Structures are given as C-alpha cells and as structure tokens.
Design a protein around this ligand. Structure first.
Ligand SMILES: *P(=O)(O)OCC(C)(C)[C@H](O)C(=O)NCCC(=O)NCCS
Length: 89
C-alpha cells in the first residue's frame, strides 16, 4: 500500500462527499471523476512533477491511467510513494 489510504484521500479529497475517504469504496473507477483527468490532472501533474522534477512529457496522459485508483498507486509506487497529510499540502 505505501500510504494507499492517502492516494484514495488525495483524489477523493478533490470531491469527497459527507463520508470520510476511509469509508468510501476506493475501488470505484475514477473515470467517473474524469473531472480530475483534465483540470485536476494539470494541477496534479504540475505539483507532482514539481516535487520530483519529472518532465510532464516523460509520462503520457490517458483516461486508462485513471481507470482505477489501484492502477495509479502501482505506477506511483513503482517509482516513488510520497505520503501527504492533505491534498492541499
Ligand atoms: P480531460 O481530462 O478531458 O483530458 C482527457 C485526457 C487528459 C485523459 C486526455 O486528453 C485523453 O482523453 N486521453 C487521450 C489523449 C488526448 O486526447 N489528448 C488530448 C489532446 S489531443
């Protein structure tokens, strides 16, 4: 997991209902949340890339990458797993 709860909280915090992300089925395809795929993706890539100084072109953007939260956790875990107390930070 390497802070898997933070990953679900990170994306869920963008639009979490009155339920704590820990009580939300993080098994939901973020595709419905595709909202993050375009607007949030730009903000996430700019922030995520700034912390690791990774070129945005290095990674290709596609809806399949956000098909599920677990798929994103493996990609990030494969390279790095940074725990964050809140998405704002
Ligand atoms: P937004 O979230 O609507 O943008 C969709 C994303 C970022 C997933 C991307 O555009 C996409 O749909 N994947 C295919 C690649 C693509 O269409 N690039 C957009 C410029 S042609």
């Amino acid at each position: 997991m390497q802070h898997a709860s933070v990953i679900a909280q990170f994306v869920v915090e963008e639009f979490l209902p009155d339920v704590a992300p820990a009580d939300v089925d993080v098994d939901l395809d973020l595709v419905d949340n595709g909202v993050i795929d375009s607007l949030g993706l730009l903000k996430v890539i700019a922030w995520l890339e700034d912390r690791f100084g990774i070129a945005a072109d290095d990674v290709e953007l596609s809806p399949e990458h956000f098909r599920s939260i677990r798929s994103i956790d493996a990609f990030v875990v494969g390279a790095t797993t940074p725990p964050v107390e809140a998405k704002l930070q």
